[PDB]
Design an enzyme around this catalytic site. Structure first.
Site, PDB file in Angstrom:
ATOM      1  N   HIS A   1       4.906   0.510 -15.008  1.00 27.43           N
ATOM      2  CA  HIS A   1       4.342  -0.323 -13.952  1.00 27.43           C
ATOM      3  C   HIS A   1       3.147   0.376 -13.311  1.00 27.43           C
ATOM      4  O   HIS A   1       3.060   1.606 -13.304  1.00 27.43           O
ATOM      5  CB  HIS A   1       5.406  -0.692 -12.910  1.00 27.43           C
ATOM      6  CG  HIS A   1       6.346  -1.755 -13.399  1.00 27.43           C
ATOM      7  ND1 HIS A   1       6.749  -2.822 -12.622  1.00 27.43           N
ATOM      8  CD2 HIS A   1       6.927  -1.931 -14.613  1.00 27.43           C
ATOM      9  CE1 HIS A   1       7.549  -3.600 -13.333  1.00 27.43           C
ATOM     10  NE2 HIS A   1       7.682  -3.075 -14.539  1.00 27.43           N
ATOM     11  N   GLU A   2       2.224  -0.429 -12.779  1.00 29.89           N
ATOM     12  CA  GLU A   2       0.879   0.013 -12.426  1.00 29.89           C
ATOM     13  C   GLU A   2       0.290   0.841 -13.573  1.00 29.89           C
ATOM     14  O   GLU A   2      -0.017   2.025 -13.406  1.00 29.89           O
ATOM     15  CB  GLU A   2       0.854   0.793 -11.117  1.00 29.89           C
ATOM     16  CG  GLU A   2       1.391  -0.030  -9.942  1.00 29.89           C
ATOM     17  CD  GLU A   2       2.907  -0.155  -9.977  1.00 29.89           C
ATOM     18  OE1 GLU A   2       3.567   0.889 -10.151  1.00 29.89           O
ATOM     19  OE2 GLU A   2       3.441  -1.292  -9.877  1.00 29.89           O
TER      20      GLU A   2
ATOM     21  N   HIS B   1      14.271   5.615 -13.820  1.00 25.79           N
ATOM     22  CA  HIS B   1      13.181   5.133 -12.976  1.00 25.79           C
ATOM     23  C   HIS B   1      12.456   6.320 -12.373  1.00 25.79           C
ATOM     24  O   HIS B   1      13.081   7.150 -11.702  1.00 25.79           O
ATOM     25  CB  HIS B   1      13.687   4.214 -11.863  1.00 25.79           C
ATOM     26  CG  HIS B   1      12.583   3.591 -11.071  1.00 25.79           C
ATOM     27  ND1 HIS B   1      12.499   3.692  -9.698  1.00 25.79           N
ATOM     28  CD2 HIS B   1      11.502   2.874 -11.465  1.00 25.79           C
ATOM     29  CE1 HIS B   1      11.421   3.049  -9.278  1.00 25.79           C
ATOM     30  NE2 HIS B   1      10.799   2.543 -10.330  1.00 25.79           N
ATOM     31  N   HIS B   2      11.143   6.378 -12.593  1.00 24.68           N
ATOM     32  CA  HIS B   2      10.268   7.443 -12.105  1.00 24.68           C
ATOM     33  C   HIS B   2       9.106   6.780 -11.372  1.00 24.68           C
ATOM     34  O   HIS B   2       8.080   6.495 -11.991  1.00 24.68           O
ATOM     35  CB  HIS B   2       9.745   8.310 -13.253  1.00 24.68           C
ATOM     36  CG  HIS B   2      10.784   9.171 -13.897  1.00 24.68           C
ATOM     37  ND1 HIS B   2      10.583   9.776 -15.116  1.00 24.68           N
ATOM     38  CD2 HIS B   2      12.023   9.538 -13.493  1.00 24.68           C
ATOM     39  CE1 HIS B   2      11.657  10.475 -15.441  1.00 24.68           C
ATOM     40  NE2 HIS B   2      12.545  10.350 -14.471  1.00 24.68           N
ATOM     41  N   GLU B   3       9.255   6.532 -10.070  1.00 25.50           N
ATOM     42  CA  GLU B   3       8.131   6.096  -9.247  1.00 25.50           C
ATOM     43  C   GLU B   3       7.395   7.318  -8.709  1.00 25.50           C
ATOM     44  O   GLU B   3       8.017   8.222  -8.140  1.00 25.50           O
ATOM     45  CB  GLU B   3       8.602   5.217  -8.085  1.00 25.50           C
ATOM     46  CG  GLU B   3       7.484   4.848  -7.101  1.00 25.50           C
ATOM     47  CD  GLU B   3       6.360   4.043  -7.756  1.00 25.50           C
ATOM     48  OE1 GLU B   3       6.634   2.950  -8.303  1.00 25.50           O
ATOM     49  OE2 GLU B   3       5.195   4.504  -7.737  1.00 25.50           O
TER      50      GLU B   3
ATOM     51  N   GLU C   1      -3.212  -6.458 -10.279  1.00 25.86           N
ATOM     52  CA  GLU C   1      -2.263  -7.392  -9.669  1.00 25.86           C
ATOM     53  C   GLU C   1      -3.006  -8.382  -8.769  1.00 25.86           C
ATOM     54  O   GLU C   1      -2.976  -8.315  -7.537  1.00 25.86           O
ATOM     55  CB  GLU C   1      -1.176  -6.626  -8.920  1.00 25.86           C
ATOM     56  CG  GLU C   1      -0.197  -5.916  -9.870  1.00 25.86           C
ATOM     57  CD  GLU C   1       0.838  -5.053  -9.146  1.00 25.86           C
ATOM     58  OE1 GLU C   1       1.864  -4.697  -9.770  1.00 25.86           O
ATOM     59  OE2 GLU C   1       0.621  -4.723  -7.959  1.00 25.86           O
TER      60      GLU C   1
ATOM     61  N   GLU D   1       3.719  -3.568 -16.882  1.00 29.76           N
ATOM     62  CA  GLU D   1       3.431  -4.649 -15.950  1.00 29.76           C
ATOM     63  C   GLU D   1       1.931  -4.956 -16.007  1.00 29.76           C
ATOM     64  O   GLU D   1       1.485  -5.666 -16.916  1.00 29.76           O
ATOM     65  CB  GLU D   1       3.912  -4.276 -14.545  1.00 29.76           C
ATOM     66  CG  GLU D   1       3.966  -5.441 -13.582  1.00 29.76           C
ATOM     67  CD  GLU D   1       4.525  -5.027 -12.228  1.00 29.76           C
ATOM     68  OE1 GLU D   1       3.946  -4.119 -11.589  1.00 29.76           O
ATOM     69  OE2 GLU D   1       5.558  -5.595 -11.818  1.00 29.76           O
TER      70      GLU D   1
ATOM     71  N   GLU E   1       7.881  -9.915  -8.807  1.00 31.62           N
ATOM     72  CA  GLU E   1       8.013  -9.257  -7.508  1.00 31.62           C
ATOM     73  C   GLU E   1       7.117  -9.893  -6.453  1.00 31.62           C
ATOM     74  O   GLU E   1       7.489  -9.946  -5.276  1.00 31.62           O
ATOM     75  CB  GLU E   1       7.695  -7.767  -7.633  1.00 31.62           C
ATOM     76  CG  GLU E   1       6.293  -7.487  -8.176  1.00 31.62           C
ATOM     77  CD  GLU E   1       5.936  -6.014  -8.132  1.00 31.62           C
ATOM     78  OE1 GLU E   1       6.704  -5.244  -7.516  1.00 31.62           O
ATOM     79  OE2 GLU E   1       4.888  -5.622  -8.697  1.00 31.62           O
TER      80      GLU E   1
HETATM   81  C1  LIG Z   1       6.535  -2.594  -4.545  1.00 28.71           C
HETATM   82  C2  LIG Z   1       5.092  -2.911  -4.786  1.00 28.71           C
HETATM   83  O1  LIG Z   1       4.279  -2.265  -3.720  1.00 28.71           O
HETATM   84  C3  LIG Z   1       2.816  -2.593  -3.765  1.00 28.71           C
HETATM   85  O2  LIG Z   1       2.600  -3.834  -3.181  1.00 28.71           O
HETATM   86  C4  LIG Z   1       2.844  -3.758  -1.707  1.00 28.71           C
HETATM   87  C5  LIG Z   1       1.558  -3.627  -0.960  1.00 28.71           C
HETATM   88  O3  LIG Z   1       0.840  -2.418  -1.388  1.00 28.71           O
HETATM   89  C6  LIG Z   1       1.834  -3.542   0.517  1.00 28.71           C
HETATM   90  O4  LIG Z   1       0.610  -3.356   1.238  1.00 28.71           O
HETATM   91  C7  LIG Z   1       2.524  -4.785   1.064  1.00 28.71           C
HETATM   92  O5  LIG Z   1       1.542  -5.753   1.282  1.00 28.71           O
HETATM   93  C8  LIG Z   1       1.885  -7.159   0.914  1.00 28.71           C
HETATM   94  C9  LIG Z   1       2.351  -7.831   2.163  1.00 28.71           C
HETATM   95  O6  LIG Z   1       3.796  -8.106   2.074  1.00 28.71           O
HETATM   96  C10 LIG Z   1       1.687  -9.103   2.613  1.00 28.71           C
HETATM   97  O7  LIG Z   1       1.180  -8.870   3.938  1.00 28.71           O
HETATM   98  C11 LIG Z   1       0.561  -9.633   1.738  1.00 28.71           C
HETATM   99  O8  LIG Z   1      -0.301 -10.404   2.505  1.00 28.71           O
HETATM  100  O9  LIG Z   1      -0.226  -8.548   1.130  1.00 28.71           O
HETATM  101  C12 LIG Z   1       0.595  -7.666   0.265  1.00 28.71           C
HETATM  102  C13 LIG Z   1       0.835  -8.335  -1.034  1.00 28.71           C
HETATM  103  O10 LIG Z   1      -0.191  -7.897  -1.904  1.00 28.71           O
HETATM  104  O11 LIG Z   1       3.661  -5.283   0.228  1.00 28.71           O
HETATM  105  C14 LIG Z   1       3.669  -4.969  -1.243  1.00 28.71           C
HETATM  106  C15 LIG Z   1       5.104  -4.766  -1.622  1.00 28.71           C
HETATM  107  O12 LIG Z   1       5.783  -3.999  -0.652  1.00 28.71           O
HETATM  108  C16 LIG Z   1       2.275  -2.538  -5.187  1.00 28.71           C
HETATM  109  O13 LIG Z   1       0.995  -3.190  -5.201  1.00 28.71           O
HETATM  110  C17 LIG Z   1       3.227  -3.169  -6.168  1.00 28.71           C
HETATM  111  O14 LIG Z   1       2.657  -3.168  -7.489  1.00 28.71           O
HETATM  112  C18 LIG Z   1       4.550  -2.450  -6.130  1.00 28.71           C
HETATM  113  N1  LIG Z   1       5.458  -2.811  -7.265  1.00 28.71           N
HETATM  114  C19 LIG Z   1       6.068  -1.637  -7.986  1.00 28.71           C
HETATM  115  C20 LIG Z   1       6.845  -0.772  -7.163  1.00 28.71           C
HETATM  116  C21 LIG Z   1       8.468  -0.709  -7.262  1.00 28.71           C
HETATM  117  C22 LIG Z   1       9.185   0.567  -6.793  1.00 28.71           C
HETATM  118  O15 LIG Z   1       9.105   1.502  -7.823  1.00 28.71           O
HETATM  119  C23 LIG Z   1       9.143  -1.517  -8.251  1.00 28.71           C
HETATM  120  O16 LIG Z   1      10.325  -2.056  -7.690  1.00 28.71           O
HETATM  121  C24 LIG Z   1       8.205  -2.716  -8.845  1.00 28.71           C
HETATM  122  O17 LIG Z   1       8.948  -3.359  -9.910  1.00 28.71           O
HETATM  123  C25 LIG Z   1       6.982  -2.173  -9.275  1.00 28.71           C
HETATM  124  O18 LIG Z   1       6.177  -3.083 -10.024  1.00 28.71           O
HETATM  125 CA   LIG Z   2       3.997  -3.595  -9.352  1.00 31.29          CA
HETATM  126 CL   LIG Z   3      -1.482  -2.896 -11.722  1.00 27.84          CL
END
Ligand SMILES: C[C@H]1O[C@H](O[C@H]2[C@H](O)[C@@H](O)[C@@H](O[C@H]3[C@H](O)[C@@H](O)[C@@H](O)O[C@@H]3CO)O[C@@H]2CO)[C@H](O)[C@@H](O)[C@@H]1N[C@H]1C=C(CO)[C@@H](O)[C@H](O)[C@H]1O
Ligand SMILES: [Ca+2]
Ligand SMILES: [Cl-]
Ligand SMILES: [Cl-]
Ligand SMILES: [Mg+2]
Length: 662
Positions: free
Chosen positions: A436-437, A356-358, A154, A455, A461
């Site tokens: 995802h991931e 959904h399985h996180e 990502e 993803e 997102e």
């Molecule tokens: C939900 C999402 O979480 C992960 O991304 C998060 C980061 O790990 C956090 O550290 C946080 O940092 C961001 C900050 O808002 C901001 O300060 C920026 O400067 O740096 C960061 C952006 O990189 O915020 C992020 C989101 O809270 C993870 O990397 C990401 O892939 C995750 N996405 C999956 C998770 C959910 C829950 O199951 C689903 O809704 C998504 O569709 C998934 O793809």
């Molecule tokens: Ca993600």
């Molecule tokens: Cl990824």
């Protein structure tokens, strides 16, 4: 030894004159890949490196075609020449191995085949010596994301001289100064560690296998093969896109009748959590309630969506869910999520719940509950499940046989096998998986057609909170990098772009409205989300009609024009299935930060047929920063002899339905 593509333009020379076995590749009689090493180092076994000589070559060829159950095209043509080159080294510390090369008009694939031989028992590969030595790397341009970083796949893509791409994920796409486009990737990544590319001497990209925590890369017992290493080569950027080489290098479908895998469109209790109108955990703003889910199902039933994804339905999200991988339950819903009631409502409405399985990275806690979790979903009429593995790079958590925690990479052999176990177990329940991931796509949807999408790149997102969000060029980067690997669950279709304010300095999709529509044709996926809150679609019903109309399953696809990081134009013909007659064509085009005019011939349309183009395009004064919503919708009679001028606003796009008449 030499093998050539059917048309003769790609020529691979396999040699044993260098220190090791090696290969090189020319395109139209200009070398594009210089002498590139082949071989292995092992933890204990003697290396397969120098002093191997060619003893035998076996030539054969293929000219066939096969049908996909679902996909970006119904019929896939496989035309290639093949050579198996056998290398042998005399004792002491001798051995033998073969490399199989397949040369297509659009690129080449090769893999090692190491046969049974004395002393080849339990082995641990510590290095694969495979190189991709790019000729004239000092004048080549690359578009790439870093590998082994804390955020996995990502990342936004970098545009740099090729010699600055130090350690990169694949698909790794670049062009040389002649304008030849090349992309390196792999196919059929099974029971092996993912390949990262590590630039050694300038232009020499060496395979860098993602290791176990213990430090070795790949554990094998006896004879083994590698996945395919792939090198796509084309005169034009779109020649990379229009290739089937990744699918063609995978084994045929192993799941038999897969009519239970259903391409379609979905909505979800999802974006509200990303923009903080709801929470995943329990409380006054909890997204995953019976009432909310029924409201989404009603909307899906009325507007033609197959399913509703709901995140936060199961206990374990309270607090800081990023840290709750140990405590997630995959069978126990929150008290405000009545899964039996929603099962009944799914049958009433004809709209399915999408599971959904996180895991938040703890794959052992998931593995121990996985059989019960899928049994619950099968009992509950759930046919698709979105999985998640949120943890920093290298921080998958597993518990080993002695109860000791270990950290692993998402793309090591351990996780490669862990993902496939999940997919195969899901298939026994007639459940399809959206990961995802994930591990990067290497074409395994051919072999396991319930692995429908993933993803594995920055999607929508990051436009809710990315700080910064995806840049205008992001889609036109994805189309020639990530999308070469296979389908992506991007979750397109955000209609309210203003939730954080307009302008260029807020977290929002940095696009126009028409570009959001174009995504449904530009970014292939068998399931496509309409990602926004339902009320935001009800505010724009004319624009919403395109999302209601557009299919997700195609009998043919053609990237008509494009340039990496600048623009892409796709035309696709719908597959005959469900409500779709198979007669309509669709087009999507997007640009980067620049407004662009693109001239398009409509000669992809069926000859002798009349179509009514339903054109959704940027308004006259549209521009993504402060005027993203200006939109024009036009109906125009056209045939294959007509042409279109696409006028794309800054970070704009155009979406077209070509409705076949009578
Ligand atoms: C939900 C999402 O979480 C992960 O991304 C998060 C980061 O790990 C956090 O550290 C946080 O940092 C961001 C900050 O808002 C901001 O300060 C920026 O400067 O740096 C960061 C952006 O990189 O915020 C992020 C989101 O809270 C993870 O990397 C990401 O892939 C995750 N996405 C999956 C998770 C959910 C829950 O199951 C689903 O809704 C998504 O569709 C998934 O793809
Ligand atoms: Ca993600
Ligand atoms: Cl990824
Ligand atoms: Cl974007
Ligand atoms: Mg650009």
């Amino acid at each position: 030894a030499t093998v050539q593509s059917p048309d003769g333009n790609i020529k691979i020379i396999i040699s044993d004159e260098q220190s090791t076995p090696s290969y090189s590749i020319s395109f139209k009689n200009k070398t594009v890949i210089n002498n590139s090493a082949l071989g292995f180092e092992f933890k204990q076994h003697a290396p397969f490196s120098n002093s191997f000589k060619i003893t035998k070559v076996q030539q054969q060829s293929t000219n066939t075609q096969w049908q996909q159950p679902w996909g970006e095209r119904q019929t896939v043509v496989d035309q290639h020449n093949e050579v198996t080159v056998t290398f042998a080294k005399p004792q002491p510390q001798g051995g033998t191995y073969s490399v199989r090369f397949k040369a297509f008009d659009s690129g080449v694939g090769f893999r090692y085949e190491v046969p049974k031989q004395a002393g080849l028992n339990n082995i641990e590969i510590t290095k694969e010596l495979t190189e991709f030595a790019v000729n004239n790397s000092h004048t080549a341009t690359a578009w790439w994301i870093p590998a082994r970083g804390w955020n996995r796949y990502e990342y936004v893509y970098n545009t740099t001289p090729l010699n600055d791409a130090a350690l990169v994920h694949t698909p790794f796409t670049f062009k040389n100064q002649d304008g030849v486009h090349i992309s390196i990737h792999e196919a059929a990544l099974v029971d092996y560690a993912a390949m990262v590319l590590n630039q050694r001497r300038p232009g020499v990209f060496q395979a860098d296998l993602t290791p176990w925590s213990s430090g070795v890369a790949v554990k094998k017992q006896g004879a083994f093969n590698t996945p395919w290493r792939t090198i796509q080569i084309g005169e034009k950027a779109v020649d990379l896109v229009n290739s089937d080489i990744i699918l063609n290098l995978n084994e045929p479908n192993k799941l038999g009748d897969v009519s239970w895998v259903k391409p379609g469109k979905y909505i979800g209790i999802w974006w509200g959590m990303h923009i903080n109108t709801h929470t995943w955990g329990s409380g006054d703003k909890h997204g995953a309630t019976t009432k909310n889910t029924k409201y989404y199902m009603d909307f899906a039933a009325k507007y033609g969506f197959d399913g509703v994804l709901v995140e936060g339905w199961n206990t374990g999200w309270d607090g800081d869910w990023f840290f709750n991988g140990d405590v997630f339950s995959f069978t126990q819903p929150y008290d405000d999520f009545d899964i039996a009631a929603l099962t009944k409502y799914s049958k009433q409405t004809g709209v399915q719940l999408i599971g959904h399985h996180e895991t938040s990275g703890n794959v052992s806690n998931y593995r121990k509950q996985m059989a019960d979790a899928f049994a619950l979903y099968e009992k509950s009429n759930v046919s698709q499940v979105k999985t998640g593995y949120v943890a920093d790079g290298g921080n998958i958590k597993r518990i080993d046989k002695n109860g000791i925690a270990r950290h692993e990479w998402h793309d090591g052999q351990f996780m490669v096998n862990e993902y496939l176990h999940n997919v195969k177990l899901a298939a026994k329940h007639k459940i399809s998986i959206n990961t995802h991931e994930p591990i990067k796509d290497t074409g395994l949807r051919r072999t396991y057609p319930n692995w429908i999408t993933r993803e594995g790149a920055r999607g929508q997102e990051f436009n809710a909170w990315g700080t910064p969000p995806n840049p205008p060029e992001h889609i036109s980067m994805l189309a020639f990098t990530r999308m070469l690997a296979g389908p992506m669950d991007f979750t397109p279709g955000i209609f309210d772009l203003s939730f954080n304010g307009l302008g260029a300095n807020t977290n929002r999709p940095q696009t126009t409205l028409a570009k959001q529509l174009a995504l449904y044709v530009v970014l292939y996926s068998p399931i496509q989300m309409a990602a926004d809150l339902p009320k935001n679609y009800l505010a724009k019903p004319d624009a919403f009609q395109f999302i209601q109309d557009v299919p997700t399953d195609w009998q043919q696809s053609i990237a008509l024009d494009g340039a990496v990081g600048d623009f892409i134009v796709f035309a696709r013909k719908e597959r005959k299935r469900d409500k779709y007659t198979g007669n309509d064509w669709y087009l999507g085009a997007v640009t980067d930060e620049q407004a662009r005019t693109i001239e398009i011939s409509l000669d992809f349309l069926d000859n002798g047929k009349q179509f009514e183009a339903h054109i959704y395009k940027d308004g006259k004064n549209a521009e993504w920063k402060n005027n993203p919503y200006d939109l024009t919708i036009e109906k125009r009679l056209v045939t294959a002899s007509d042409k279109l001028t696409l006028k794309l606003a800054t970070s704009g796009g155009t979406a077209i339905r070509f409705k076949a008449l009578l």
